[PDB]
């Protein structure tokens, strides 16, 4: 039969891919990085606590400068904070209270947010009238929006509840490109240091690497066992990390198709909600559902510290472009900035 | 005011004004009570939402605002989404109650309704939210029972050995078979309700007809009991 023949061909192709990956498996990452000195203990203390959200926080994003920040809460609020002085610069109410994502334009002139409504709203910050307006409202998705990341002042990539991600055109409001390769809900995406490729993690335990200009998939990585809730790109742009519902963070490489290392522990049984890398990329910070965050030595899979105590499930985690501070927001109404001590 | 420039005090004043506006918004937010409506394609939740919207007055969500006894209720109904609920339902972990509409007169898909109730009740994040159960379409169920063509024992083999409990206060003027069937259907859901509730959250079984004007009062009373139990648990009384 044609159906059975196609399934057999697919199985043959998968076997060939696995055989090639095994052929390229010269030595493990853990074996190579074993004589390097361990980091030790990474003790980070809270410097600022930002209050003013009436409900759980779902998203957060630093500006290109390492000072201003934006956060989204399901009471229907988008609050911009000056982290140095804890001041509130803007407080934008939203048409829909259910907001699951938040973005900050690299130029600092725009913000974006989406949620259960299948609409991405872009708000203009620099107006001659002194108030923040709704610059654009992009519609066309048929599911809740999980993530959105700005490319320029006139381009943005969004991932929604359906299996598709889309690159839009803010000036015209129409999807310039559609990717439509996944099988489950896409939950996160990460832009490369040069914005030509980007990865997407979904609920089929697989990650996909797409080329923005051509709108096609390049590689598919499958090492996890459950839904992937977060993704972060390595600082050098040649690897990434994924966190899933199972208590595991997996590091995947690009030039070598296969997977590099696994970060897991016997005592951890909850899921990972967010991941991030430091400026050097040596440390990998992951927030968990047990109201905690862990710092893993990404080159040795050794836990080097715990950011402990947020009173509710940690939702979002980010690192400044300068690498000076780590911002963490949870299902509690608060956002905490953490920094090291000399 | 110490070591603060003339342009920093004004920024602090702007932040304080923003904070006072946030306080007013918090008061308004605490004033209203939020509910989450759930049902299948045959549940009939559209009729309930219409009757409680018009009388008491593409998009991924629908909002209905009503007011009973000077109390403001905000019901949220999911629409134009996919069939996988395991990801976007965790948003509704702070609602006051989950209204759950079940078509009782549909024996074939009753097991699906039981499975949905089981998955909602035992969820990790929805384990402290009470469920208001509306067993819609009682007239159709009574008509089907009176017809006698379809037997509940075919789908649930334990119905043949089930007898209606004594002192169950049957409605005067109702057929004994209809009362037995209704009590069995409510029994099937209260088993899941009391299987692992442990008193943290409770379920309120209700019977609803095709055109009933008392649904708002039922929701109001169930919400009153929910808030009363929450307040009792706060003071460690119970």
């Amino acid at each position, epitope marked *: 039969s044609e159906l059975d023949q196609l399934r057999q061909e697919a199985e043959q192709l998968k076997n060939q891919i696995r055989d090639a990956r095994k052929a390229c498996a010269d030595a493990t990452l853990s074996q190579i990085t074993n004589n390097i000195d361990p980091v030790g203990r990474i003790q980070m203390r809270t410097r600022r606590t930002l209050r003013g959200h009436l409900a759980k926080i779902y998203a957060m994003h630093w500006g290109t400068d390492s000072r201003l920040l934006v956060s989204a809460s399901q009471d229907g609020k988008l609050i911009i904070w000056d982290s140095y002085t804890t*001041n509130k610069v803007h407080a934008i109410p939203l048409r829909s209270s259910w907001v699951m994502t938040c973005a900050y334009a690299p130029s600092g002139n725009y913000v974006a947010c989406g949620g259960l409504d299948n609409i991405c709203s872009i708000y203009n910050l620099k107006t*001659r*009238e002194g108030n923040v307006r709704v610059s654009r409202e992009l519609a066309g998705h048929t599911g809740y929006l999980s993530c959105c990341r700005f490319l320029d002042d006139n381009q943005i990539v969004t991932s929604s509840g359906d299996t598709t991600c889309a690159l839009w055109d803010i000036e015209t409001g129409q999807q310039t490109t559609t990717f439509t390769g996944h099988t489950g809900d896409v939950m996160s995406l990460s832009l490369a240091p040069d914005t030509r490729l980007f990865v997407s993690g979904a609920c089929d335990a697989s990650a996909k690497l797409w080329d923005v200009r051509e709108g096609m998939c390049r590689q598919t990585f499958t090492g996890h066992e459950s839904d992937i809730n977060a993704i972060c790109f390595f600082p050098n742009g040649n690897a990434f990390a994924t966190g899933s519902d199972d208590a595991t963070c997996r590091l995947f490489d690009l030039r070598a198709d296969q997977e590099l290392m696994t970060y897991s522990h016997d005592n951890i049984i909850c899921g990972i909600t967010s991941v991030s890398f430091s400026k050097s990329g040596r440390l990998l910070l992951a927030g968990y559902d047990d109201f905690n965050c862990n710092v893993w030595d990404a080159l040795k899979a050794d836990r080097a510290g715990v950011l402990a105590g947020h009173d509710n499930r940690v939702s979002c985690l980010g690192v400044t472009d300068d690498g000076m501070a780590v911002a963490t927001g949870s299902w509690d109404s608060f956002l905490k900035i953490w920094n090291g001590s000399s | 005011g110490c070591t603060l*420039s003339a*342009e920093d005090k004004a920024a602090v004043e702007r932040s304080k*004004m923003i904070e006072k506006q946030l306080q007013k918004d918090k008061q308004v937010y605490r004033r209203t009570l939020r509910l989450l409506l759930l049902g299948a394609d045959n549940s009939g939740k559209s009729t309930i939402v219409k009757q409680m919207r018009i009388y008491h007055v593409t998009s991924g969500i629908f909002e209905t605002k009503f007011q009973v006894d000077k109390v403001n209720f905000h019901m949220f109904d999911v629409g134009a989404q996919r069939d996988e609920r395991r990801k976007w339902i965790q948003c509704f972990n702070d609602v006051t109650a989950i209204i759950f509409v079940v078509d009782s007169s549909d024996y074939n898909r009753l097991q699906e309704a039981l499975n949905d109730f089981k998955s909602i009740w035992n969820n990790r994040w929805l384990r402290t939210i009470s469920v208001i159960l509306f067993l819609n379409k009682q007239d159709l169920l009574a008509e089907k029972v009176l017809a006698g063509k379809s037997k509940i024992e075919d789908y649930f083999p334990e119905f043949a050995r089930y007898t209606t409990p004594e002192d169950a206060t049957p409605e005067p003027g109702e057929d004994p078979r209809v009362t037995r069937a209704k009590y069995f259907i409510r029994k099937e859901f209260v088993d899941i309700s009391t299987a692992s509730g442990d008193g943290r959250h409770i379920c309120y079984p209700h019977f609803t007809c095709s055109v009933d004007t008392e649904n708002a009062r039922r929701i109001f009373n169930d919400c009153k009991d929910i808030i009363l139990q929450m307040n009792l648990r706060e003071y460690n009384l119970v």
Partner: single-chain antibody
Amino acid sequence: DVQLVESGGGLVQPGGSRKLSCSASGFAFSSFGMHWVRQAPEKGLEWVAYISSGSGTIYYADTVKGRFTISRDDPKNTLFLQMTSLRSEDTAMYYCVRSIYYYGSSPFDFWGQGTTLTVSSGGSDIVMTQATSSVPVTPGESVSISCRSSKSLLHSNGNTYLYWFLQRPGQSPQLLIYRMSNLASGVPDRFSGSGSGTAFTLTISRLEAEDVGVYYCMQHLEYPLTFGAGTKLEL
């Protein structure tokens, strides 16, 4: 678009009372603090009074203190300045200015049209010296303007609070450079600014016929605000 229209000026007897109403249209009035700026027939601008957003804080100049009162009607989008017991030194043109304050804000961005008024018949201050009052230069050549402050304008935040204003003949001043480095919206890249804590320099790379007029220095360190003497650039 954005409009600030003043009214209430006229000829008054000495010792009388007067009121000016500044109507604002086209922007969120309640979110902007407001200033009154007085320009005498003689060269030079002088800050008069300031009221914050929501009227939280009110500031007056040491000269008009005790005789001038500034208030605002947010629902009516109007700013009132009432004066009692006038003198012969208050005959001038009044400009209505708006200013918004946050981290990256641009204060003193828009100025009102201004209304003229004629009358019949210092320790906590920072001075500004603009020695070159008049600089004649053919257009198409670079132009340099110098400003000096008695006190250092650099705060502990690293922000230097210095503002440059352009007044071309017949029109109210418009903000060019704020905080000594940034450029106001709608200002061509010809204008550049720099300077140390005490001395500041503004450069116009390619002069044109539009830039003829007076240039004014200003500070924002301590709330008594002092404008410069004003350097007049002409062909």
